[PDB]
Design a protein around this ligand. Structure first.
Ligand code: 7F1
Lengths: 195, 239, 215, 243, 211, 228, 237, 236
């Protein structure tokens, strides 16, 4: 299972994922890069599930959003992007479902920093903190406890370090390699963390 | 008439279909093909069209099945479409029933294909006339026309300046039934020559010749045998 | 309260193939059976595709018949269109396309395509009902394949023999095929009656017949 | 031969022009005048009402200005039936965008969609074009207040102040010489009345022949007001005092 | 089946076994699991032999037409994307394909693992088949990017041998090819693993080896 | 193949719609009047011969409760459009549980009429419709032209001499008239238009008033009204 | 006035006749087939100095063993060549062998006459107005075929297309021999092109391609080969 | 549906519909595109009614994807429809190949679409000519020109639209290989004003680099126009 974590503050959004590409009982790669889908205009789709469905849905959404932005010479709003993603997932749910969980993060002037939680059933809602996978059970309470308003990026990264330590110590799958996407100060940064 | 030849679904005040008539007119512009039959064999000869000095002569007779072949006069694309149709019909009958198709039914289906194109204004008649030589319990020659009609002949000839060939065939018709294979081939070559212009000559390059018979599957006559036959024709004409 | 109908049956059969320097052999048993009954004692399993190519299949008789007829129709259409007879490699690719066209409801037929190519070399292709593999020396499909293939491996490859034999000829290979089919008839209930042996070589295709046990 | 009856509407002419589109433009230019302008407080759309009879129900009856959405409205010049078809389509398009994206469609995007319908009609098939031209005004948070003009060919262009229909040259001259970048809603309404009077060749406008509407964005909401006869009469009294 | 590929300082090493089976019966010992898609791309196939062969031929046709139209060689990434999209369109039909596409293009040497479920993983070292775990262990215990060609070929041969030894579905002959900038060479056309066992594990041949 | 038979002319007109309007203006006259508490539609239905059954000809029809329709033009076109209007009304009822609104029905029928001026292989409808109705928003009288444009009328006339009839009706129409006054004025207008002497057999009347079901007056009631 | 399928009183299709009129223009190309291979040469009517030479090519490759010279409408020619490429690729896929040049030519003609709608489907609305010279090497050896809008395919030992087709054909007829070698074929092709060309023959106004029986691989001559043949050419007379 | 053959052969062998599409193109504005070492410069004529039209709305210089840009001359609605088709095809190529669509591929697609519209029944040709500037898979800048007939060709510097011949002659006279950005912009402005009235609001210029397409600032265009005006005054 792929553990996804998302934290939204007044000045940032941090997304985190494990970097494992899994095929049966072996890890194909310890530095997987098929979960994050960065979208022009400060948007990010973090996907979790089977690699095939992940790739198909992520690329479909990214190309559709890029087509929209090129056709309209404008940046799609984060709320529009999130609800477009949810509408597509719901449309395919009853025909040929993608078995993917989504964390949709972004920034725009109208609504600031935004984070949306969506499950494979296409149940979506905007949240301040969210998680997906079997590691959600072990990181959700840490997020709840140590989250507060007016949190800073470094305090959020400390919370994420606590989460990664918990996933290494107590989670059945000892996950040690994580990738983070940080949106703040109208710039997107990539980090790699090993515990 | 200028007012009634625009489309193929309009009858003239004389009840004529000028578009279909023009499709038939396309046939008279082709090279001459002749087909005759004895009690056992059908021989089909034809004049291959050479565009220029450096061009190869064009094909005139085609094989449809083991004991079925055709010659065409008119538009080559139409001839190709009909040839593919006939070949697929014969092959599909062999596939479904493990036996040779009935030539009469094949010709009827080809004639229906002709006709179905003359009933709509979005289509046009085939500008090609077909001569079908086959052996099915006996030799048979069929002619299919652009308007959807088909007839059965004892001897047949179409193409440009083919009336000389028709005259020769009408003169020698009584002899074909009891002829041998060599005599029949010579007669077909002589009719083709009758059509041919005096300046032109029948050579192995511009003459196509095929035979289909009792135990003789449709076969083109080899170049050497054709040369022998043409030499015989020239020699006996010299007398 | 009705039971579902299964669209597949096995009608038995064994087809062996064996190549040589300038020849190929395809032998097949002619029994047709349904469960523990014999439909008929003479149902040929080998069809001639070209003067240098034949195909033998084992499995469901209706599927085999339809597939052989379809291949023959395709080859005749190819001859008419492209004005030359396809060789065994073209026929192999054609059969592969035909077989994968029904990938999700496959023909219940395992087929050996035997022939001689333009170099005058024997060629065998083994088809597992969807796909093809070129066989270097020998092949076998049908109910007796598991009995026969070890024998042909022992007699041809001789991989487990320090003192080997290399003089292989048409008569010895024919005798090997007869022995293999007889041994299969000993222990396989679906192989028996008569067997047809086709030899393709420079002189063409020749068909001989051998008698097997009728029980 | 059914082709003898075909007029070949979607066919080029020797000059690289479409006769059907040119004739539709002639119909539009024969239609009555529709003006539009942008103030710092909103978009004002005005139209001249063509007189039919005094038995027409003149209350709650706007026939040249329509609402496409809460933030988009349009004025029509051309064939009313074609305009109604295109207006229903535009309303469907705006609601479809809201359904797809959970946000209101931008005015430029809506204009592009309806103009694409018109262009497709001019290019594909063998049907005649739409004899209607639009002045689509609206507001959105991306480009602010917007005013677009669309013609039968599918061409469209953005404007700060424009006029379509009969005698649009006089209205365009008036707007060119009077319009200002920063105007209040009242000033814009007075200018709209002046240009309508000039196009209609009159001094004192009559409220019985004037349609006025304005779309503003106040207190975080887009509000459209279609002035009634009494409100237009108050505006006309103000205009009379001014001039 | 055991197929493996890995990048090293002089290109890519591709290796496979030659065994085919239906159930517990060995159908053949001399099948070819490495195919060339074009001059600069090799695909190693595992799983359903018919599915792999048919879809590799399909990909080759698509790549040939693309190259003819655009007068340029296709990239390994683009070929992998085409194959993965095609395979994903058939998800839920029973296709069995695991393909490693390794090749040289304008962006250096590239290696992608593609599955019948629509996966496409870029990597430096892959292994597929029923012996993939054993091959993976052997490769990981002794892999290095600075191996010479001979050392890399030896490592691939050893990994295939151990996979065949431990896995009942792998065996026959071992083939090792080398992809370099100008094409590909077949270093080991096919080598019986019978000799490999008595070279590696039981050189003395004086008693039965005890695993 | 389908191409538009109605096309723009060099002056920007649709002569086919003009000619449909000519047919309507040559057809028999109909009128509608909105009263203070109701709306009436009247029409002149003459008898071409003594053998026809007047009760079989239906010019004033009921689309639904509280909605009636009359036409001037071609009866076959009218019958087609009347069937379509009834189908649309019951479609709205199936969707929304209540009766269709007059404005909504008029818009739908107007769009249907418009489609026949643009689609391929067809001619425009050769009639004008007058649709009267009552709903929660009041009393409505709408006219639909062959082009597909609709007009909201206080009182109107279509058909022959519609200009003279409109002038006559305007000279004696005010918005505060009652149903009885409206019926009297309708009969007066029809009598003025008709050459000769009118009678209850030559006219038909339908009324929708006081939130009551649409009613088609009988010969006896029309005779009572004509006595004056 | 007339439909695309109308027959003329002489039995001909008006649209086909008009497409035949269309194919009469364009850059002039010649093709020569000898025992050792087939060579197609063409003139390049470079529009101006700002055009990229590589972006314009009158000699294309339909397959690894088939080359084509085109004349008439260039967009229609590119459409036809793309269709031929697709069909040759599909044939190679389904038969694992190289298509015959005759079969390729037949497919091209079938597409060319598509607008007639004689068998039901049809997508083209009019003839193509394109003339082709298709050369290649198959199991029967080198061959050269000419296709025209009317759908008729001929086989030539030497042929020409373009604006100067008549003069090129006269020169080829009076200078071509059956038993010429490849060097003589190249010399003859470039001599005809030089004679019929408006501009002085150079290494930038002419392009050549060859399919030799040995390799059976389409090969585009570059400046080195073109200049070598130019030097070998005899002085104009 | 409607499938009449709108584009047919004339007795002389011409496609009159295509000729009329070319006439529509000649009735359009002027667009110039000049190539350089690793960048391109595209200038286009603007036609706005002062003080009433919104200059930003009309856009003849558009971006198809992250690396391809387009200019056109002819019918604006046809251009818009074709450009939307091309953008969709750019994203479809990206989805199908995992790489951005190169300029040569996109130009070929545009030309194929225009040919198809000349060769399909029930449709009329696009009345627009296009200049497409982009990068190839080897990161090489390239400019392509496509016409209503569907014929495309790569160029070093090309002008389309009204009075395209004069601008093309000026380009052939004044073009040099591997110019700097400012010199290339000056050349494009001079070429376009060879036929367009000299004014900074009569032209829109963009510079395409691997990074992005950047529109030149109004002050820079004003300075360059003043320099051109000074040169013209001196010459006269
Ligand atoms: C690897 C093994 S594995 C366990 O990792 O899947 C091999 C890979 C392989 C084998 N052959 C080739 C050829 C080309 C490329 C790759 C190849 N896979 C297999 O061997 C398959 C394993 C099963 C579990 C999927 N086996 C097969 O596909 C069978 C091949 C075959 C059958 N008869 C033959 C005769 C001669 C040569 C080969 C074969 N075929 C099947 O089992 C499929 N059908 C299913 C229906 O019943 C008939 C067999």
């Amino acid at each position: 299972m792929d553990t996804l974590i998302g934290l939204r503050g007044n000045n940032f959004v941090v997304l985190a994922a494990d970097t494992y590409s899994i095929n049966s009982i072996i890890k194909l790669k310890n530095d997987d890069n098929t979960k994050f889908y960065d979208i022009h205009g400060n948007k990010c789709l973090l996907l979790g599930g089977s690699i095939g469905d992940r790739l198909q849905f992520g690329e479909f959404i990214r190309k559709n959003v890029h087509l929209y932005q090129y056709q309209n010479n404008t940046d799609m709003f984060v709320k529009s992007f999130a609800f477009f993603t949810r509408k597509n997932l719901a449309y395919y749910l009853r025909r040929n479902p993608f078995e993917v969980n989504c964390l949709i993060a972004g920034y725009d002037k109208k609504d600031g920093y935004q984070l949306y939680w969506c499950d494979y059933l296409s149940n979506m809602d905007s949240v301040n903190k969210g998680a997906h996978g079997y590691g959600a059970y072990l990181v959700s309470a840490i997020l709840d406890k140590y989250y507060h308003e007016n949190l800073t990026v470094d305090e959020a990264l400390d919370i994420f370090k606590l989460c990664f330590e918990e996933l290494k110590k107590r989670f059945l799958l000892t996950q040690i390699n994580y990738e983070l996407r940080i949106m703040y100060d109208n710039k997107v940064e990539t980090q790699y963390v090993t515990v | 008439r200028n007012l009634y030849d625009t489309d193929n679904i309009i009858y003239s005040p004389e009840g004529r279909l000028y578009q279909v008539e023009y499709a038939s007119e396309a046939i008279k512009q082709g090279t001459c093909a002749v087909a005759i039959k004895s009690k056992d064999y059908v021989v089909v000869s034809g004049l291959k069209k050479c565009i220029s000095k450096l061009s190869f002569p064009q094909e005139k007779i085609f094989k449809i099945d083991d004991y079925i072949g055709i010659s065409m006069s008119g538009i080559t694309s139409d001839a190709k479409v009909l040839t593919k149709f006939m070949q697929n019909e014969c092959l599909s009958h062999k596939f479904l029933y493990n036996e040779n198709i009935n030539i009469e039914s094949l010709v009827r289906s080809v004639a229906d294909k002709y006709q179905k194109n003359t009933q709509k204004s979005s289509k046009r008649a085939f500008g090609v006339g077909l001569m079908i030589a086959a052996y099915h319990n006996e030799p048979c020659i069929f002619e299919t026309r652009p308007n959807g009609s088909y007839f059965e002949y004892d001897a047949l000839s179409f193409g440009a300046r083919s009336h000389a060939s028709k005259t020769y065939l009408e003169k020698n018709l009584h002899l074909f039934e009891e002829c041998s294979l060599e005599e029949l081939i010579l007669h077909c070559l002589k009719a083709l020559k009758c059509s041919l212009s005096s300046e032109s000559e029948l050579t192995i390059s511009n003459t196509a010749l095929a035979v289909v018979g009792k135990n003789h599957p449709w076969q083109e006559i080899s170049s050497l045998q054709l040369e022998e036959y043409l030499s015989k024709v020239k020699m006996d004409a010299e007398q | 309260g009705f039971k579902r109908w299964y669209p597949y049956i096995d009608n038995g059969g064994t087809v062996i193939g064996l190549t040589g320097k300038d020849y190929v052999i395809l032998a097949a048993d002619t029994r047709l059976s349904l469960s523990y009954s014999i439909y008929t004692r003479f149902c040929p399993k080998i069809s001639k595709l070209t003067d240098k190519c034949i195909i033998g299949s084992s499995g469901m008789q209706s599927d085999i018949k339809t597939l052989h007829s379809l291949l023959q129709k395709k080859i005749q259409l190819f001859v008419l269109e492209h004005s030359h007879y396809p060789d065994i490699h073209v026929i192999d690719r054609l059969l592969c396309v035909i077989l994968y066209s029904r990938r999700f409801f496959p023909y219940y037929a395992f087929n050996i395509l035997a022939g001689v190519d333009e170099n005058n070399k024997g060629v065998l292709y083994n088809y597992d009902s969807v796909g093809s593999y070129c066989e270097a020396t020998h092949s076998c499909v049908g109910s007796g394949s598991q009995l026969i293939l070890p024998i042909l491996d022992n007699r041809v490859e001789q991989k487990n023999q320090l003192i080997k034999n290399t003089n292989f000829n048409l008569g010895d290979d024919i005798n090997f095929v007869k022995d293999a089919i007889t041994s299969a008839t000993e222990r396989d209930i679906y192989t028996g009656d008569k067997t047809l042996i086709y030899v393709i070589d420079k002189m063409g295709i020749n068909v001989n017949t051998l008698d097997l046990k009728q029980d | 031969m059914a082709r003898r009856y075909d007029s070949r509407t979607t066919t080029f002419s020797p000059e690289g022009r479409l006769y059907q589109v040119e004739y539709a433009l002639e119909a539009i230019n024969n239609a009555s005048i529709t003006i539009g302008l942008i103030t710092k407080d909103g978009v004002i759309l005005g139209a001249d009402k063509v007189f039919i009879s005094k038995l027409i129900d003149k209350a709650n009856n706007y026939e040249k200005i329509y609402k496409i959405d809460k933030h988009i409205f349009c004025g029509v010049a051309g064939l009313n039936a074609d305009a109604n078809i295109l207006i229903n389509q535009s309303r469907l398009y705006a609601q479809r965008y809201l359904y797809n994206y959970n946000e209101v469609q931008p005015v430029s995007q809506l204009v592009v969609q309806i103009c694409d319908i018109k262009q497709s009609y001019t290019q594909y098939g063998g049907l005649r074009p739409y004899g209607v031209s639009f002045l689509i005004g609206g507001y959105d948070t991306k480009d602010g207040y917007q005013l677009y003009h669309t013609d039968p060919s599918g061409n469209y262009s953005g404007w700060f102040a424009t006029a379509i229909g009969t005698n649009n040259l006089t209205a365009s001259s008036v707007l060119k010489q009077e319009w200002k970048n920063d105007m209040t809603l009242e000033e814009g309404l007075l200018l709209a009345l002046k240009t309508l009077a000039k196009s209609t060749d009159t001094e004192i406008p009559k409220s019985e022949k004037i349609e006025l509407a304005y779309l503003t964005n106040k207190d975080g909401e887009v509000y459209q007001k279609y002035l009634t006869e009494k409100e237009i009469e108050e505006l006309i009294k103000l205009y009379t005092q001014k001039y | 089946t055991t197929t493996l590929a890995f990048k090293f300082k002089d290109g890519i090493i591709v290796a496979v076994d030659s065994r085919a089976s239906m159930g517990s019966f060995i159908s053949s010992q001399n099948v070819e699991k490495i195919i060339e898609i074009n001059k600069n791309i090799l695909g190693t196939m595992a799983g359903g032999a018919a599915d792999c062969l048919y879809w590799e031929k399909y990909l080759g046709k698509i790549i040939k037409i693309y190259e003819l139209r655009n007068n340029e060689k296709i990239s390994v990434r683009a070929a992998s994307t085409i194959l993965s999209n095609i395979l994903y369109q058939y998800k839920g039909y029973g296709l069995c394909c695991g393909i490693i596409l390794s090749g040289y293009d304008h962006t250096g040497f590239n290696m992608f693992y593609v599955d019948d479920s629509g996966k496409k993983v870029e990597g430096n070292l892959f292994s597929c088949g029923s012996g993939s775990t054993y091959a993976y262990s052997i490769l990981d215990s002794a892999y290095d990017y600075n191996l010479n060609l001979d050392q890399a070929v030896e490592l691939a041969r050893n990994a295939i041998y151990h996979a065949t030894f431990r896995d009942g579905g792998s065996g026959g002959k071992v083939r090792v090819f080398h992809i370099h900038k100008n094409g590909y060479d077949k270093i080991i056309e096919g080598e019986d693993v019978f000799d490999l066992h008595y070279h590696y594990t039981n050189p003395e041949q004086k008693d039965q080896y005890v695993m | 193949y389908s191409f538009s038979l109605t096309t723009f002319s060099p002056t920007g007109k649709l002569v086919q719609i003009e000619y449909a309007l000519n047919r309507v203006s040559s057809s028999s006259p109909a009128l509608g009047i909105r009263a203070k508490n109701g709306v009436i539609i009247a029409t002149e239905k003459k008898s071409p011969n003594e053998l026809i059954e007047e009760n079989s000809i239906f010019k004033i029809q009921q689309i639904s409760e509280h909605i009636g329709i009359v036409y001037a033009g071609m009866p076959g076109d009218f019958r087609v459009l009347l069937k379509r209007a009834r189908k649309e009304a019951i479609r709205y009822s199936l969707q929304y549980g209540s009766e269709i609104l007059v404005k909504e029905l008029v818009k739908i029928i107007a769009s249907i009429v418009q489609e026949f001026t643009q689609t391929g292989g067809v001619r425009p409808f050769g009639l004008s419709l007058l649709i009267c109705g009552v709903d929660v928003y009041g009393y409505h009288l709408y006219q639909i032209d062959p082009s597909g444009c609709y007009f909201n009328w206080m009182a109107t006339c279509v058909g022959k001499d519609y200009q003279n009839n409109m002038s006559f009706l305007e000279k004696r129409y005010n918005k505060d008239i009652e149903i009885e006054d409206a019926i009297h004025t309708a009969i007066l207008t029809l009598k003025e238009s008709y050459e000769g002497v009118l009678n209850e057999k030559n006219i038909e009347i339908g009324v929708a008033y006081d939130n009551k079901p649409f009613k088609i007056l009988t010969q006896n009631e029309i005779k009572d009204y004509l006595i004056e | 006035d007339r439909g695309v399928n109308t027959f003329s009183p002489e039995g001909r299709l008006f649209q086909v006749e008009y497409a035949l009129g269309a194919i009469k223009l364009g850059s002039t190309a010649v093709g020569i087939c000898v025992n050792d291979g087939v060579i197609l040469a063409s003139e390049r009517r470079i529009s101006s100095t700002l055009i990229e030479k590589d972006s314009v090519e009158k000699l294309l490759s339909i397959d690894d063993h088939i080359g084509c010279a085109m004349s008439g409408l260039m967009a229609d020619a590119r459409t036809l060549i793309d269709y031929a490429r697709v069909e040759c690729n599909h044939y190679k896929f389904i038969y694992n062998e190289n298509i015959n040049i005759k079969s390729c030519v037949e497919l091209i003609s079938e597409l060319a006459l598509d607008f007639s709608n004689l068998s039901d489907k049809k997508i083209m609305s009019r003839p193509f107005g394109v003339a082709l010279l298709i050369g290649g090497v198959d199991k029967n050896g080198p061959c050269l075929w000419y296709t025209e809008p009317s759908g008729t395919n001929t086989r030539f030992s030497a042929a020409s297309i373009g604006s100067a087709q008549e003069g090129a054909e006269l020169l080829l007829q009076e200078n071509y021999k059956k038993d010429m070698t490849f060097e003589q074929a190249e010399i003859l092709a470039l001599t005809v092109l030089r004679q019929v060309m408006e501009d002085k023959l150079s290494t930038s106004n002419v392009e050549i391609c060859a399919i030799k029986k040995s390799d059976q691989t389409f090969y585009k001559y570059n400046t080195d080969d073109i200049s070598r043949i130019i030097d070998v050419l005899p002085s104009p007379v | 549906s409607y499938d009449r053959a709108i584009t047919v052969f004339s007795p002389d062998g011409h496609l009159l519909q295509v000729e009329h599409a070319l006439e529509a193109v000649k009735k359009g504005g002027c667009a110039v595109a000049i190539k350089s070492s690793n960048f391109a410069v595209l200038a286009v004529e603007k036609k706005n009614i002062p003080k009433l039209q919104n200059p930003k709305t009309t856009e003849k210089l558009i971006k198809l994807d992250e690396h391809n840009c387009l200019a056109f001359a002819g019918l604006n609605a046809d251009a818009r429809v074709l450009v939307n088709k091309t953008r969709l095809e750019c994203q479809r190529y990206y989805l199908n190949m995992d790489e951005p669509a190169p300029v040569d591929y996109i130009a070929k697609y545009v030309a194929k679409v225009q040919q198809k519209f000349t060769h399909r029944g029930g449709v009329r040709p696009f009345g627009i000519a296009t200049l497409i500037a982009g990068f190839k898979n080897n990161k090489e800048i390239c400019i392509y020109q496509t016409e209503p007939s569907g014929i495309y060709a790569a160029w070093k510097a090309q002008a389309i639209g009204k009075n395209a011949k004069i601008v093309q002659e000026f380009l052939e006279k004044n073009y040099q290989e591997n110019m700097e950005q400012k010199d290339c912009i000056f050349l494009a402005l001079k070429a376009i004003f060879e036929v367009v009235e000299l004014s900074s609001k009569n032209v829109e210029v963009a510079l395409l680099t691997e990074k992005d397409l950047t529109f030149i600032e109004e002050q820079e265009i004003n300075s360059m126009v003043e320099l051109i005006d000074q040169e013209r005054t001196k010459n006269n």
